[PDB]
Design an enzyme around this catalytic site. Sequence first.
Site, PDB file in Angstrom:
ATOM      1  N   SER A 235      -9.615  -2.876   4.395  1.00 28.58           N
ATOM      2  CA  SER A 235      -8.892  -3.879   3.621  1.00 28.58           C
ATOM      3  C   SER A 235      -8.274  -3.193   2.401  1.00 28.58           C
ATOM      4  CB  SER A 235      -9.783  -5.119   3.334  1.00 28.58           C
ATOM      5  OG  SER A 235      -9.107  -6.056   2.498  1.00 28.58           O
ATOM      6  N   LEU A 236      -8.820  -3.398   1.196  1.00 28.95           N
ATOM      7  CA  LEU A 236      -8.311  -2.686   0.013  1.00 28.95           C
ATOM      8  C   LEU A 236      -8.255  -1.176   0.244  1.00 28.95           C
ATOM      9  CD1 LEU A 236      -9.399  -0.902  -2.666  1.00 28.95           C
ATOM     10  CD2 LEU A 236      -7.334  -2.338  -2.819  1.00 28.95           C
TER      11      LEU A 236
ATOM     12  N   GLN B  83     -13.381  -3.735  -1.444  1.00 23.32           N
ATOM     13  CA  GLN B  83     -14.151  -4.602  -2.302  1.00 23.32           C
ATOM     14  C   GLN B  83     -15.549  -4.774  -1.771  1.00 23.32           C
ATOM     15  OE1 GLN B  83     -10.714  -7.871  -2.904  1.00 23.32           O
ATOM     16  NE2 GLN B  83     -12.736  -8.627  -3.491  1.00 23.32           N
TER      17      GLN B  83
ATOM     18  N   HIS C 214      -8.088 -12.827   4.593  1.00 19.87           N
ATOM     19  CA  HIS C 214      -7.855 -12.330   5.944  1.00 19.87           C
ATOM     20  C   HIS C 214      -7.770 -13.453   6.988  1.00 19.87           C
ATOM     21  CE1 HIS C 214      -7.672  -8.208   4.636  1.00 19.87           C
ATOM     22  NE2 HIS C 214      -8.794  -8.374   3.948  1.00 19.87           N
TER      23      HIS C 214
ATOM     24  N   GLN D 141      -1.664  -7.644   6.746  1.00 15.22           N
ATOM     25  CA  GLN D 141      -3.098  -7.351   6.599  1.00 15.22           C
ATOM     26  C   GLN D 141      -3.838  -8.431   5.813  1.00 15.22           C
ATOM     27  OE1 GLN D 141      -4.793  -5.097   3.450  1.00 15.22           O
ATOM     28  NE2 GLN D 141      -5.843  -3.628   4.790  1.00 15.22           N
TER      29      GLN D 141
ATOM     30  N   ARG E  51      -1.939  -7.419  -5.570  1.00 18.66           N
ATOM     31  CA  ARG E  51      -2.533  -7.886  -4.327  1.00 18.66           C
ATOM     32  C   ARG E  51      -3.737  -8.787  -4.617  1.00 18.66           C
ATOM     33  NH1 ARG E  51      -6.897  -6.078  -0.791  1.00 18.66           N
ATOM     34  NH2 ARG E  51      -6.368  -6.271   1.440  1.00 18.66           N
TER      35      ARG E  51
END
Length: 307
Positions: free
Chosen positions: A90-91, A10, A199, A248, A115
């Site tokens: 991340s993504l 993102q 996160h 994560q 998600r």
Amino acid sequence: MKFAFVFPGQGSQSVGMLNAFADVAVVRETLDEASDALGQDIGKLIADGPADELNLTTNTQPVMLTAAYACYRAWQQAGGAQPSIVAGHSLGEYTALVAAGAIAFRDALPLVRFRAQAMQTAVPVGVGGMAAILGLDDDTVRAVCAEASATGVVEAVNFNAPAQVVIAGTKAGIEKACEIAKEKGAKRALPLPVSAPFHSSLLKPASDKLREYLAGVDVKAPKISVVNNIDVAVVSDPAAIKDALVRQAAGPVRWVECVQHIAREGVTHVIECGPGKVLAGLTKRIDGNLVGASVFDPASLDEALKL
């Protein structure tokens, strides 16, 4: 020579970002597959936006998976070799798992939509957020957060490059951490335009929903080594991959370490696969002996073919 592919998450999206690939048959087929999986025209969402639609996280996460994966499929269509190791931010870890054959793209699409939904609704509206701290080393940022935490939970949650750290937690914690960071000499310490404390440990409820969702997803052992954000580990067991994805969401993205892990495997070429140039810049900062390229349109793809 061995190379790595790293996949963006993102924040790397923009309206028109796949225009240059409009006439590459596999990019067209990937956008078609994504639209079929998600029920809307992903090609036109990306090409025309508006930006306010493209930037809704429930769109941004599947958009960034699609766009970066499109770029991977174009690399293959062009005859590009398989990288020896992959990772994503991340993504982008999802995209890496897809490229590695661990998760089918068709399955990855509703997974990352889900998600996004999970992460956006884990905590009540306005509870928390994120901030970017520039100029302080990781342990100093940790100290800043530990000190700020008396006003509310706040943690160092993205380690992106030397002197580049994102923190996340309660609105109050984030504010106080910025103030402390500035006092300690940060070049910059500013809230990010994000509405949820991604996160951070506050996102545990998102992890819990992800665990339930991943229970029904067929994950396979990867054909390419994937280094994960949470543990900086290369795991082959499907259950372990799933668990790394669960943790994560509410744990630190150890991106510097993933890149260093890649370098210690004797990879000297690290190619960012997808739009936005974000990861390209971080590789430069993490280790200047690494040689970067990017695949985000036909011209950049050809230059990457060379490297």
